[PDB]
Amino acid sequence: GCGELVWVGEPLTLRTAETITGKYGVWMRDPKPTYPYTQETTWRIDTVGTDVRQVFEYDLISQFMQGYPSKVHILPRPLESTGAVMYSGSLYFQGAESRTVIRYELNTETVKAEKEIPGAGYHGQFPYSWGGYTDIDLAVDEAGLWVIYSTDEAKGAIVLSKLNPENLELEQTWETNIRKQSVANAFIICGTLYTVSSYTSADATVNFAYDTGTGISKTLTIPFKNRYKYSSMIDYNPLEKKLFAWDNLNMVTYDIKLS
Ligand SMILES: [Ca+2]
Ligand code: NA
């Protein structure tokens, strides 16, 4: 049931980090879960600092919300920023101080693929407006895996590419007119890129859309609340049909409605 985004609900807090290491981070579920995981499995990465390698895994939502991890994975190289996603059994993340995306299969703890995103800025060239080295943002939608970035040729405007999830080859690329550094974050729903106007405001908006199927850009005014005033991560999960976000220690989720 695809369509255009028309409404975002109030943020619901599912878990709050207890230390500064989790001021910013990424949490996520796999929209294409594979053995030994299920649609309830949740992963959490607290991303403050310079040697981020611990991935917390929770078999059950109850454990994610109230308990300790059921397993901790140690990544084979440090991860950069908050843009990572889970897809079909693999964590897709950016290597620290690089433009390299790594496909890391959690059940075997093996690197299955690596790819330098051609021309992508990294390490503070084209971050979102809050900084945080957020130059490269992976995304999953109804059609699969994407990457959101920019390049010198695009003059800092958001570029998005569809990725082959097995080998990380770029399959198609689109260039928007939206300055990446001017928006707080972005995500993709049903092939349309959406941006958020501010990471601090209780009265932010989903403010731009770019439809990859038609090439048309639009402005929007859909209200979006940053309840804790510092949103470092905003992604869409196409299985739950919800936004997942990280806001100033808090792992939150927003309902949505599509036309
Ligand atoms: Ca995002
Ligand atoms: Na992401």
Residue numbers in the entry: 244 to 502
Please quote the authors directly.
However, not all mutations in MYOC cause glaucoma, and common variants are expected to be neutral polymorphisms.
Assessment of spent media from cells expressing each of the 16 full-length myocilin variants revealed WT-like secretion for T256M, R296H, L303I, S313F, V329M, S331L, T353I, A445V, V449I and K500R. No gross changes from WT OLF were detected for the structures of T293K, R296H, L303I, V329M, S331L, E352K, T353I, K398R, A445V, V449I or K500R, indicating that these mutations are accommodated within the native five-bladed β-propeller fold and do not perturb the dinuclear calcium-containing site. In addition to the five variants that we predicted initially to be benign (T293K, T353I, K398R, A445V and K500R), our study reveals seven more (T256M, R296H, L303I, V329M, S331L, E352K and V499I) that are indistinguishable from WT OLF across multiple assays. Thus, our data indicate these should also be considered benign.
